[PDB]
Amino acid sequence: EVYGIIAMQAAYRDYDSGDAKQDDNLGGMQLNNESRIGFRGKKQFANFEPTFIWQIEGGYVDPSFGGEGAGLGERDTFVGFESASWGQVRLGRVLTPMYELVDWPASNPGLGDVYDWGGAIGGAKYQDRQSNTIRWDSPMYADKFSIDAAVGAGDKAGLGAGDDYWGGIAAHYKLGPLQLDAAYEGNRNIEAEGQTWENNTYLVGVQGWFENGISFFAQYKYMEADASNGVNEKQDAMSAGLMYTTGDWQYKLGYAANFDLERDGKTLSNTSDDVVSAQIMYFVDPSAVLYARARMNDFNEGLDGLDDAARWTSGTNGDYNEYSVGVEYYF
Amino acid sequence: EVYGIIAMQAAYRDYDSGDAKQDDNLGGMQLNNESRIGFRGKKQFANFEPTFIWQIEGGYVDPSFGGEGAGLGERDTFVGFESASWGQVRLGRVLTPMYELVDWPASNPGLGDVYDWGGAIGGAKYQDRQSNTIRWDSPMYADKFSIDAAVGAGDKAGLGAGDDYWGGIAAHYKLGPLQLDAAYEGNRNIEAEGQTWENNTYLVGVQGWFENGISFFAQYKYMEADASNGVNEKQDAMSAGLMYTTGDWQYKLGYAANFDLERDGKTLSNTSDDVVSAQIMYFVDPSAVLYARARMNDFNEGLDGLDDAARWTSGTNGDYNEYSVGVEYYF
Amino acid sequence: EVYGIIAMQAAYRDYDSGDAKQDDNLGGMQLNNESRIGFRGKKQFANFEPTFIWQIEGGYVDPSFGGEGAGLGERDTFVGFESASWGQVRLGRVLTPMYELVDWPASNPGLGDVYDWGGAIGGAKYQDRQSNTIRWDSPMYADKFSIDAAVGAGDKAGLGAGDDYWGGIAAHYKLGPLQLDAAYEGNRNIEAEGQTWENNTYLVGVQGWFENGISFFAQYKYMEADASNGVNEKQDAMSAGLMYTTGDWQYKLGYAANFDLERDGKTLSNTSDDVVSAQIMYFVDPSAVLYARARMNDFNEGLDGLDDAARWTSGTNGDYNEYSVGVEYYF
Ligand SMILES: CC(=O)N[C@@H]1[C@@H](O)[C@H](O[C@@H]2O[C@H](CO)[C@@H](O[C@@H]3O[C@H](CO)[C@@H](O[C@@H]4O[C@H](CO)[C@@H](O[C@@H]5O[C@H](CO)[C@@H](O[C@@H]6O[C@H](CO)[C@@H](O)[C@H](O)[C@H]6NC(C)=O)[C@H](O)[C@H]5NC(C)=O)[C@H](O)[C@H]4NC(C)=O)[C@H](O)[C@H]3NC(C)=O)[C@H](O)[C@H]2NC(C)=O)[C@@H](CO)O[C@H]1O
Ligand SMILES: CCCCCCCCOCCOCCOCCOCCO
Ligand code: NA
Ligand code: NA
Ligand code: NA
Ligand code: NA
Ligand code: NA
Ligand code: NA
Ligand code: NA
Ligand code: NA
Ligand code: NA
């Protein structure tokens, strides 16, 4: 089966980086084309009861700040087996359990710069979409309790340049108009800044959907990191969103923040990030969506890693505001 | 909808660069596989009356002088809305209205080395296929008159590395068996040779299809560039083709040429290019063609950019002849 | 037609390079998703008797030791013509007649490290999947005898950086339950290690399918290399496999070896490779197979090339064992 998301975003960015020329280069209008084509199917094997499943999904065809063209396999790509009894098992390239919650609901709308790949902690706070991953998704036990669990090789292990690995787990419990989310990811043998690291991330969160038309989500994220030289790092973060849904319209206010990193008990000042985001969406069709969105990103103004060199963050390119109109179509 | 063009061209090139080894490297037989796979669709949104259109076309799967493999998104790839009243508007990666005229009819067959990317002027005479583009295509007003107009980001801006931008427009008016074409493209903030350029390119041409089997096109192209140091460059070009189509055969002669480049009033000697080209083509099927082609490219023998380093042109690799056969099958 | 091979291999590798960090980096578990998508078709042109055939195949979407994402055209991608009388001709990216036999049957299960790209000989023992190739595949004469023939441009010529080319031919004759195989490849103008090489490579082999469930294959390969500074190099190599097939199961033992390389008449000590492999496979469906596989690779411990630098071989990373299970599903 061939499927696709046609996603296009006309976004103007106004940067305040400290450098005028950097401002000009990074800012401006671009067309963020995140369309992707994918292939998926199921197969009932004669001599095996669990149904075989596989998916190959291509990447963004023409993103902003990037070249044209994407290959098949850049997004969620896997084989696996499923049965109503014990759920779904996927082998390959999937989202970690932690990341799936960080992305949804917490990174919408345009909260990702802060809540998704933002942060200042060393090592690996978590993977996002990872290859070399075994992920078990349980069924909806009693229609309320579900579990995601996964393990996989790290980024350098994926290329034969390392021994990094990671495990993760998330749970969800539905309680009427409420859902309680709890996730964890541990990362190990992460080689960065002349050190080996271990990372532990925990996430708690609630989302609510009321027949009154108001929906909301709130997430708390706690990030710990330990370097082989003895340094310990801590940073926490939050994300919250408020939605009002009337017919063919939806209103959304989002906010997310990274708080000052702490290193060996001392707080590194000016290492926090915050983003405020507003969006109106119009359900133009059962299968598609239009949207306008405006967001303000205020990132940290910089910090050094354990190798006494600047550590990269979603704030190195500097603070920016974004106005965008988008469309999104599913088939 | 899956679609494709299957294009294979077996081409032998004989170079005369002045260097025996370079002649040997660049020349010889190759297979130019410009086959490509596309996806496109329309969708009629319930709550929006203009038809939604989208397309994602892959790149040449295995071209001459290149590696194997093409991602999805490399050729025309866009989303838009179409309504018979006011035409179609596309956002994404399309051809600029200029380039579409310099490509067809004026770069066929094999004229493109001189008339497409050829030429000695600095800055950017025009974009070809460009990402981050809004393009309006008018209807054929009264079945005779059409306008193509577009603005977009530059090559550096698309990467966050510049502030270049451009707009263009082209007009066509069908007068019985003839079509008049005019177009323009301006590029701004182009960073090259250590200067900031503005380009302006002007194109006029004519195209004819008569009932006696004779067909033709001629175009005149005028290219001006202005550098921030006040340097002014000026270069013009022509391209013309004669075709005789009889039954299942089509004979074609093409000629294109760039004339000596003028910088600050002075003609730069020996900066011209010309290509003459013959082609026989067989309509093997309603969906496919076969063709042989021979062409002779005589390029300029070099010039210096505003940085006092040699400026790269389609002639840098050297004069060459080319004998090719190919097949093209649309599905 | 859309088609596909879904292929996933969970592989555990234990290396012994003599550096425990390299052993940790290279070793460990990976998921080797060699899944690919492809498009192929035929078309009877109205004015041409041979059937037009074409195919574009994508690459491994997420292989082990590599990154995610494959483009279209990475695997067999060609146009051509077939007729019952004289066979089929293909232009594009296909397998070399030699390499086809080297891959099947002689590289399975897991013998390719030694027998496919393994070996110590200079130049290019043979191409494998080569672009810029034209390949004739004969009909199966009298349902018994078949010929493959190809010529093609070399890797550097395909980028206009060289003049390497190659030719090859392969014969197959069915004798009762046996298949007899012979094949040859010549490569010319191969620029490596500061020299220009000519490679000649010869191959003979037999395959048997018996009615008691046993089948086997055995192949002998002889590779010769001649450098422009007058060095001559020879190496030979073998590969065999035993199989027993009952109901829905197949057992398989495989062995392959590269023998010591001889250079300028003097054999170079300790340049031989060895692989033993066992495999169990379960025909989990007419469309798919499960398999577990264990194999042991003992590679050469070093040789120098003609540029006084270590010559890369499949042994450079070091000796290693591999335990794996996989699934393969064709649609
Ligand atoms: C049912 C359900 O679950 N959901 C329903 C859903 O269908 C609907 O709502 C939609 O939800 C989906 C998710 O469910 C949303 O999809 C997400 O959308 C966002 C964007 O909209 C995607 O975000 C991208 O994520 C990747 C991370 O992997 C980002 O990658 C980063 O990109 C930046 C680019 O600037 C990189 O920066 C560069 O970095 C290099 C590296 O060092 C540096 O050198 C450079 O300086 C730097 N360059 C520049 C120019 O800055 C950065 O490194 C990189 N980071 C990483 C780790 O790769 C990518 O940029 C993100 N893109 C944007 C834009 O933010 C997200 O991945 C995607 N996920 C999924 C799973 O879909 C969707 O947005 C949402 N739609 C709408 C309209 O709201 C709704 C109904 O529609 O129903 C739900 O129920
Ligand atoms: C369960 C707590 C959710 C509320 C957190 C809001 C934090 C506000 O921080 C100040 C942000 O700056 C002004 C923008 O206003 C916030 C709008 O976001 C609404 C959050 O739902
Ligand atoms: Na990762
Ligand atoms: Na800031
Ligand atoms: Na190529
Ligand atoms: Na461009
Ligand atoms: Na810009
Ligand atoms: Na010349
Ligand atoms: Na090759
Ligand atoms: Na060559
Ligand atoms: Na060894």
Residue numbers in the entry:
A (entry chain B), B (entry chain A), C (entry chain C): 20 to 350
Cite, word for word, the article reporting this structure:
VhChiP is a chitooligosaccharide-specific porin identified in the outer membrane of Vibrio campbellii type strain American Type Culture Collection BAA 1116. VhChiP contains three identical subunits, and in each subunit, the 19-amino acid N-terminal segment serves as a molecular plug (the “N-plug”) that controls the closed/open dynamics of the neighboring pores. VhChiP is a sugar-specific OM porin with the ability to selectively transport a range of chitooligosaccharides, chitohexaose being the most preferred. VhChiP consists of three identical β-barrels, each containing 16 β-strands connected on the extracellular side by eight hydrophilic loops and on the periplasmic side by eight short hydrophobic turns.
X-ray diffraction data from truncated VhChiP cocrystallized with chitohexaose were obtained to a resolution of 2.75 Å. The data were processed in the triclinic P1 space group with two trimers per asymmetric unit. We observed electron density for the sugar ligand in all six protein chains (two trimeric molecules). However, the complete electron density map of six GlcNAc rings of chitohexaose was observed only in chains B and F, while the electron densities of the sugar molecules in chains A, C, D, and E were partial, missing mainly the areas assigned to GlcNAc-1 (nonreducing end) and GlcNAc-6 (reducing end) of the sugar chain. For the structures of chains B and F,, the sugar chain was fully extended inside the pore, in a similar manner to chitohexaose found in the native structure. We observed that each of the trimeric β-barrels contained one molecule of chitohexaose inside the channel lumen in which the reducing end sugar (GlcNAc-1) made π–π interactions with the plane of the aromatic side chains of Trp123 and Tyr349. At affinity site 2, two weak hydrogen bonds were observed, one between the carboxylate side chains of Asp127 and the O-acetamido group of GlcNAc-2 (3.02 Å) and another between the side chain of Glu347 and the N-acetamido group of GlcNAc-2 (3.24 Å). For affinity sites 3 and 4, only one hydrogen bond was seen at each site, in which the carboxyl side chain of Asp122 bonded with the N-acetamido group of GlcNAc-3 (3.00 Å) and of Glu53 with the N-acetamido group of GlcNAc-4 (3.17 Å). Five hydrogen bonds were missing in the truncated structure (residues highlighted in green), including the N-acetamido group of GlcNAc-2/Arg312 (2.95 Å) and GlcNAc-3/Arg94 (2.91 Å), the O-acetamido groups of GlcNAc-3/Arg148 (2.96 Å) and Glu53/O-acetamido of GlcNAc-3 (2.95 Å), the O-acetamido of GlcNAc-3 Arg312/O- (2.90 Å) and the O-acetamido of GlcNAc-4/Asp135 (2.96 Å)/Asp145 (2.95 Å). Structural analysis of sugar–channel interactions suggested that N-plug deletion led to the loss of five hydrogen bonds that interacted with the GlcNAc moieties at the central affinity site, thus drastically weakening the binding affinity of the truncated channel.
